[PDB]
Each structure stands twice: as C-alpha cells, then as structure tokens.
Design a protein around this ligand. Sequence first.
Ligand SMILES: O=C1Nc2ccc(Cl)cc2[C@@](C#CC2CC2)(C(F)(F)F)O1
Ligand SMILES: [Mg+2]
Lengths: 543, 406
Amino acid sequence: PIETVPVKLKPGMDGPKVKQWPLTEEKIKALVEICTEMEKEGKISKIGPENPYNTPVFAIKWRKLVDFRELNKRTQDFWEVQLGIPHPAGLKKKKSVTVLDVGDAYFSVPLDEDFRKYTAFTIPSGIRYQYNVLPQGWKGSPAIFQSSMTKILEPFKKQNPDIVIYQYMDDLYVGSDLEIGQHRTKIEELRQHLLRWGLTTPDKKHQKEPPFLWMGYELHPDKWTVQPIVLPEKDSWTVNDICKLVGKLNWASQIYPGIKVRQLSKLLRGTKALTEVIPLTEEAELELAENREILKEPVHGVYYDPSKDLIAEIQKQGQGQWTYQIYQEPFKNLKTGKYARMRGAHTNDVKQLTEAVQKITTESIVIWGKTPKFKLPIQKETWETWWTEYWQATWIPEWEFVNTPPLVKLWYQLEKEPIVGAETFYVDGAANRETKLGKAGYVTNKGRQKVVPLTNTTNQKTQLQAIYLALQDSGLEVNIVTDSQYALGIIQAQPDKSESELVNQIIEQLIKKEKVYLAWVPAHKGIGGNEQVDKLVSAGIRK
Amino acid sequence: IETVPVKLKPGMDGPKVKQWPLTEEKIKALVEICTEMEKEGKISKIGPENPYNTPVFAIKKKDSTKWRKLVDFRELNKRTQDFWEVQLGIPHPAGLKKKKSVTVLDVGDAYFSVPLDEDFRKYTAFTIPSINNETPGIRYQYNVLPQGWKGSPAIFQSSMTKILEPFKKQNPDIVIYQYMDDLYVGSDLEIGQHRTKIEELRQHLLRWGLTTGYELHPDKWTVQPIVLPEKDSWTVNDIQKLVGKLNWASQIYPGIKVRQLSKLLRGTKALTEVIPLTEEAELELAENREILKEPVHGVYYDPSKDLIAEIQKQGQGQWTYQIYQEPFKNLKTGKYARMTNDVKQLTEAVQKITTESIVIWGKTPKFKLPIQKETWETWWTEYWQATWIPEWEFVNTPPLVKLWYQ
RNA sequence: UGGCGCCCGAACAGGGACUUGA
Ligand SMILES: O=C1Nc2ccc(Cl)cc2[C@@](C#CC2CC2)(C(F)(F)F)O1
Ligand SMILES: [Mg+2]
C-alpha cells in the first residue's frame, strides 16, 4: 500500500541497453536461485519481449549486485533531503533507545510502474527480469525510500510525539523517555505499524542494545563518544600512515580536548607518493606524543539539553591552533573541536579567534539550531580596538572574557600619524623578472642610505625586504614610507604569524619597535625620497 | 483564473541551491507559517521527484513581531531573466526619484491569489531544514505565484494595473512603481497629505482583497563628493597623503593634477616637516577642490549593464558606498552614517543602498560586501527586513580605497 | 561502483596589487 514515487529519465535519454557479461557456473547457478526467490516474493517480474533493455547482473551465500552506472546517470536527478548526519552532541538524552534494522529496506517500497521496465535483467544459460521494488545501488533508491519511509512514520510519530524516531540508510533509531517496560510495548506498536505497510523489522530477541556503533560514534542512551581510536606505534611513518593518523585524531578532536594536528598535517605538504617514509619531525613527534597522552583516558560526550544554554569556551593552543569546548554544564561538554585552519597567508590571533568563533557558530546552528554563549580568551577592550579599527565588518555574538594564560592580544600597533623626531625611511625594491637578482634598500632624511642585493626574490619579496631593512637599521621610533600596497596591506593587518619567513622576521622586528608609522606614496610620481630609493634599488636590476 | 505559461531560460535548468542552516527559532517559525500556507493551498508538499531547491529564510519586517518567510529566488530569477524583463517587464518611471516622499508598500500578498503555471511549480521548490538533520527537511512547492520571484509581479502587473488605474486617474501626480513585491508610491504632496493618499491607496487595495525603509525622501538624497583635507599648516605626510589621494582620484576625474603638489616633495624629508605651500601649489590645489565637487562628466546609466555597489567600512559606524557599472564611473556615491554591530550596520546599508537604486534605476545592484563569506551568510538574516534579496559578492577592501572619506 | 569529510597537486575562469616590453 506504499504510494510509488513517479520517476523518469533525463531529457533526451532512454533506458540503458548494456550487454550482459557471460557468468561462470558458480555465479549463474546462484543468481537464478536468488532471482527465483525474489520473483516468488513479488520483488521481480518477468518481462522478456516487451522490455528491450539490459543492465550488468553479477554475483559478488552469494549476494546479487547489479551495477547501475548506465541507469544512474540517465535517471532524473533527485534531491537528497537529508545529506548530512546528526552529530551525537545535537541529540538529546533518552531513557530508552532501540535500533530497528529494516530488513529488506529498499525491497519493500514499490518502484514506479512506468520505470520498472528500464531496470531489466539478463542471465545466460537466457532469462529476463525487471525490478518491481527499489533496486540496490540505484540513484533514486535512497531518496525514494526515505520519502516513502517518512510518510510511513508520520501517522505514527503524530500519534506518539514523545517517541523520537531517526531514520538512516537502513537502521531506524527509536528513542523515548519511557520506561523499559513501557518503551518495549511502544516499539512493538511501531513494529506492527511498519508491518502494515510490508516493512519488516527485528524482534526484541534479534534486536541490538547500546552502545550503538553509528558512523564511528559509540552512542549510549545518556552519553556518546567516538569509537575506540588506536594510533599505530610504528617507527617509520609514510604519507599514507600520516593521512590515517591525521584523520583518526581529527575524528577524536570532536570529543577529546586539546588534539593537535598542525605539525602532522604540515608533513603532508610536498609529498605525493604514499610510500615515501616521512622523517617525522621533532615538533610532529611532540604533537603525536601529546595526542597519544590525550587518548589514554576515555572521554565521553553528553547529549543536548534544550532547557540549558550552550557555552563555548575557546582556548589558544599556539602556532595558529585553537580548541573549543561546547558545553552546558561545567566539565560535562557536549562537543569539542579545533580551528587550526589559517585564512590567508597573513593572520593574527584576533582575526583567527573571530574565524574560530564563526566556525563554532556555524556548526552550532546545524547541530543545535542556536549560537552558544562564547567564553573567549580575549579582553573586551582588546577586541573593541580591533574591530573598530578593522576594514572588515567583523562581529562575534554575545561572548564573555575568560582569563586563561594564553590570552589573545595585538602584539603591536601602527601609529595613525607620523612620529615626531623619528627618522623617516623611504623603502622600495625592484626584482628582475628573468634573473631574479632583485635588490632592496632604504633612504632616510639624515643621509643614511643602504642597499642589500637579493637572490631568488620576487617583486613582492623585495618590497617586504625593503621594509625589513628599515626596521633593522632604525631606532625605537621609525617612519617607513613604502610605495607598495602589497607591503602596506600585509603590515597594516597587524599579523602575528604567516607562512613566509620574511614577513615573520618583520613581525618580530615590529614588536621590538615602540612606535612604527607605515606611510604610502604613489610610485613613479617623484614623491620626495621615494624617487631616490628607486634609483638605488634599480641601478642594476631594472634596465 | 488561467495560469500564464512561464518558460525557463533556454539551455538552463531550475535552481538547485543548497539550503543554508537555520536556527531553531527560524525553523519553528517557518514550519508554523508553511503549514498554514499549505492549508490555504499556496504551497504543496512534494517528494524527491524534482531536484530543485531554493533556500528559504525567516525574517521580521520593520516594526513587526510576526515572522516573515523570505525565499531566496536569486538563482531562479536569473534562470528566468527573459520572462520578467522583455516578455512582461515593468517600466521604471524616472519621476519617483525626484519626489518628496516615496512610500514603500508591501503588495506581495496579492500574488498568492494568482495560480502559478503547473509546469513551472517544479522550479519553485524549497526545503525547510531540520536542526542536526534529525528528520528530513520538509519540501514544498508554490501552487500560487511566489512572492520574491521577479516573475510574479510581471504576471500580476496585468491585474495590478486594473487595481491602480481607478486610483491613478483621480491622482495623476502619484508615481506608483512596484519592483518585486513592494509598491513605491511617490508623491510631491506634503507629509500630511501624502500619508492620507497612501491610506487612500491602501484602502484602494483592500477593496480588491490586497492586504497591506517604509518611507523614503528621494529629493533629500545627495551624493557625497570627495573632499580634500583643509588645514593651515601642511606637513610632508599630509602632502604625501594628499598626492596619493589626488593621484588615485585622477582615475575618476581626469582633470585632477598632482604636479605642483609633488614639486613640494623634492628631497628626502621628515614626514612631520611642515611644508609651506607655494603660490603655484596652492592654486593647483584649489583647482582640484572645485573639480571634485563637480559631478563625474560622461557618466551615464546603461540599462544593459548590471549595477555594482561597493561598500567600505569607514569606522565609528560610518560606511561609504559607491554604485557603478564601469570602474571609476560612479553613478552614485553616498554614505551610511545612520548606524553597535558591524553586520547589522552592513545589512542596513545594503538594504538602504538597494532601495535607493530601485527608486533611481529600478534594479538592485551587485554588492561587494567588505565582510567574510561565512560571517555574512550566518548573520545577514537576523537583520534583513526587505522582501527582495540582491546579489552580493565578498571582496577584500584595499587599504587605499577606504579613504573615500578620511 | 557511488556518496560524503580531510589533505596534496593540476587546469580553469573571474576579482585585485605589481614588474618588464611594445
Ligand atoms: O533524540 C535522540 N536521542 C538519542 C539518544 C541516544 C541515542 Cl543512542 C540516540 C538518540 C536519537 C538518535 C539518533 C541517530 C544518531 C543515530 C534517537 F532518535 F532517539 F534514537 O536521537
Ligand atoms: Mg619600484
């Protein structure tokens, strides 16, 4: 009595006509046995002459598996309504939970009458068969079954609002706050209700009890955790092993707090072959040892409690690594994680903290549908100065200051006006486009000019080098006039770190300076001493 | 009524935009109003037959507590651009931009009385998300003309004219213009009389069952020009900043010169050194001052080209925007100092800029928002209050273009 | 065999800064 979902092929296409591969004695004998059994059950019907279509049928006891590549790319596109999966942190505590594995899930939903003929079969000695139910591996089987199952459950969920039913590929999670005796009675009602539509589910004896291993999680009625993660204790590590290691402890990061993958992830840069034994760096080894210690004890998450307000405490792990603990009660956290990603080449703690907060907010809305009350390690005044003096429309929701040793702050600030009494440094650099024998230097009002040849440097690198010379050769207060927007843009962002080592050396030199003003003048306009600098840094590079 | 056959743009398929995550408060609101819409017959639940989807958001219009459904038909509008511009496009009157008051009604509730073409209802499909993806999102269609879709006013304009013709006859001085779902009613009458006429128009719409910022002052809109700093004593840094600004402004105004100003910066001098402007330099600076106040010569609106709106965060709650089609050919440069929250100010600036363009050029611009893609996409729906939604892109503002105002 | 997530590399398009030549 399940209403079929109309299906049709893409415009201009017709049902696949593929040749059947001559099966072997052990395959043909098994396949006919399967086909006869399904045919007697009504899941298959014989349409030989009126269905000039074919698909590859093979056995891989023996289990039939037909490859629907030809039909998968010719059927109309479907909308996978539920593409993602529920994070266990988003779930809610249930007194009793049961899992109903829907036996013959797809094979209980009839296929569109006008589409059955396109799913034709062919078995040699042949015999032709067509699917009267949703096939396995077909593009529309998951979406159609979910739609069909949802309509089957709506008249039961409506009658039982207390019961929470979650439907996945094959299994059906039916959670309830009812007692064990009462819950089992209600599950039987669902089992009978499903049986009315032909769907079959197992009995209590053949059912499964918690924990419920689901998509890598080990779900209990009251707590959740990732499945036991064991990291290899080998000596030599290859790119394949690092990829496994990084992925394994990325799964653990969402429950285990303080998981660092920055060093190990860096070892995957520049390596292509998976057999290349990576010489695990001391920093990578240090992180791996720390991660191993974190995984020594078992850490169990907690389920969402809508009656309470989510908190999201963020901690700074250093080197662009952040960790957050989303929780409602103290020390009992629903979910953890990390934000080690760096947006752009140049960033600072405050900008990274905002990005980490945004990432938590985005994942909190999908999981819980509400942003948490952040507890950031940044002073209110410190954040106020940043976003007020920043060119982006940055904003972070209601947050509170938490005093942790690794506080977030701006290591240096650039003056908004020229410094009186500070020697001015006009800095520029020209890089050859062929021999890459660039050059950088500075000219100051006190007749203190300097130049340093550079090699394998780019136009951009030379400009940053010219800035670095001024900071090196200046005092506590320096006025730098650079006619490059690249250097100005990078430094004005007030980064605390970056991939480039040239800019990093500048940052450690900007901090030492008690006052630094970085001006900007158009190039080639004869703007005072900037014209003189170009003469020094282009004598033997540009023309 | 008979449905008007709507044909999608040839060679283009219906939208398949993924639904952005919604908060539980918005999801609960959407289900409450979408179930009522289905009960009234405006929408119908659908299965997985069609792969189309347009994100649906929930907003609260200004001075309102009830929730409002905001369906993002930006991709569908593009995929059916021919239908609602050349086949049934609505001409934009050039008069409302000069009117003292321009009230913005909400006539988007009258579209639901017009059935939608059955062959087109597939593309007007949206999914209501579920928190944590617990249950599958609820998928709906539009059995009636969707509001927020640029084709609905085009189809409904035939009925709208008949509604407004008896009103317009008795009030020839009122310029009524609807863009997507609103009705920009412009009149030169005083504020007291204009509101009475709007009430008369509102009562006019109710007799046909069409239930009904909110008011604008186009005559009070003036583009903010580029202004150079003025001071008695000029330092080397001030001249350098001035020359850099004027040099960049030369791309906009060809008459801007920095020759004599640069002649002051000959040697290597301290940034704090006071430079006494020479007679020639002072005269040339004065020449730049009068050029800037004048409008950009040779800049005209091109209907074919899409408008582009660039917004800059000047700090202290001040935002500067420029609406242009070609670079350095600003059709309109302004400032949003009304403003707390950067995203709230940016959303208000976007809505204000879009409304200004609608009553001036009859088309929303493409927005270059100075904001992160994730930050905006998450918080822009908490402050949005306009039925329409413009196209935006996210850009990294150069440090030297933020100096539109010092 | 398909899907999703992470990382690496390549090709694409545009949105920018800049160098050299004509
Ligand atoms: O609301 C809840 N609470 C809950 C509590 C414990 C468990 Cl193990 C499962 C759930 C549940 C779910 C689910 C899908 C991930 C498997 C259930 F639907 F109830 F089964 O969602
Ligand atoms: Mg140069």
